[PDB]
Design a protein around this ligand. Sequence first.
Ligand SMILES: COc1ccc(CC(C)(C)NC[C@H](O)c2cc(O)cc3c2OCC(=O)N3)cc1
Length: 375
Amino acid sequence: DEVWVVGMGIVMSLIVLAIVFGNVLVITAIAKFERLQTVTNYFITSLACADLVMGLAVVPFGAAHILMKMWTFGNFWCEFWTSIDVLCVTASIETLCVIAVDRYFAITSPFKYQSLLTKNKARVIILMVWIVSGLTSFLPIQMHWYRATHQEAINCYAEETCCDFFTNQAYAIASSIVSFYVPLVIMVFVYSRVFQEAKRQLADLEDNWETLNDNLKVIEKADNAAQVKDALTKMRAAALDAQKASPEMKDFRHGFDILVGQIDDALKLANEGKVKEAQAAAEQLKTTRNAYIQKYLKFCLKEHKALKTLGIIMGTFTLCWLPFFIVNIVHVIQDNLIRKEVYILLNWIGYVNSGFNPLIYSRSPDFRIAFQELL
Ligand SMILES: COc1ccc(CC(C)(C)NC[C@H](O)c2cc(O)cc3c2OCC(=O)N3)cc1
């Protein structure tokens, strides 16, 4: 009855408002605030602008299509709205793939990251992704490569009020497979590699710092200056290697200058035949170890949290769009065992994940503070 129509309309309008508000908040936070113009944040901007465009151009239109039960904007605008929908979905998934690739760098080769990857390069690659998505969406649709041979589709291609998405056995596969799965597979593999490599860079920081913790304890349990020499020299090598071992490393690099001097102060006292007060000189090493192990816990957790947050973004996008593409694949291999409403339901879950991205960004402290300061 009309009660269900009104309830659906109000909840879907709330969905529209949430999506638009979150996406414009993300765009404003990136554009205005001076601390939110990193190369990754440009890709976040691309994802948010794709989400905002999808919202404005699709969600009210799809709502009208499923509430009025018939399209009321013409065949051209129907073919344009479907093109926008496919374009925005492909742009979102490909932008997530590019985000994963970007996080493959700056975790593997930051030296090549902050050298040849700048804001201009980020803009170029973002426009390249958008052009590829626009091609693969508009062209097969605009030049009518998706037209279905089944007669009611031909009726709706000239009905001027029927906007049912009927596709042949080619656009279904050669669209779902490519647009979702290829960026999906690439992004999943690349981000799994990113997570494994992050678990490895942290491990490398540790093993190097693990021996510094160990050789610190043996200093107190020492009789003469012979072993404090062995402990301090290798510890100096560990400190130098740790100094040799990205953004926010400015604090990291500067601290090691203080660190290395401490061993030289202790080692020189050790290199005199006198150890009892060089024992006391190594006591300050605990203060340094406690002060920077704190800094590293903090930065690693901020990095682990940021990596998880991008991981939560990719995971929620996958979990909200995979059912739709799965039922698309299994729907066209056979003769329509899936009702349209279930198809619409899963497609609209994929629609409504668009507002999930700003919420997940709010998990990161920086984006949360930026959004709070905007509001
Ligand atoms: C009642 O009739 C209709 C009318 C409209 C719609 C919405 C639709 C336009 C299908 N949304 C498109 C969807 O987002 C999508 C995205 C993508 O990247 C690739 C593909 C894709 O559709 C299926 C495909 O074969 N490819 C659903 C039912």
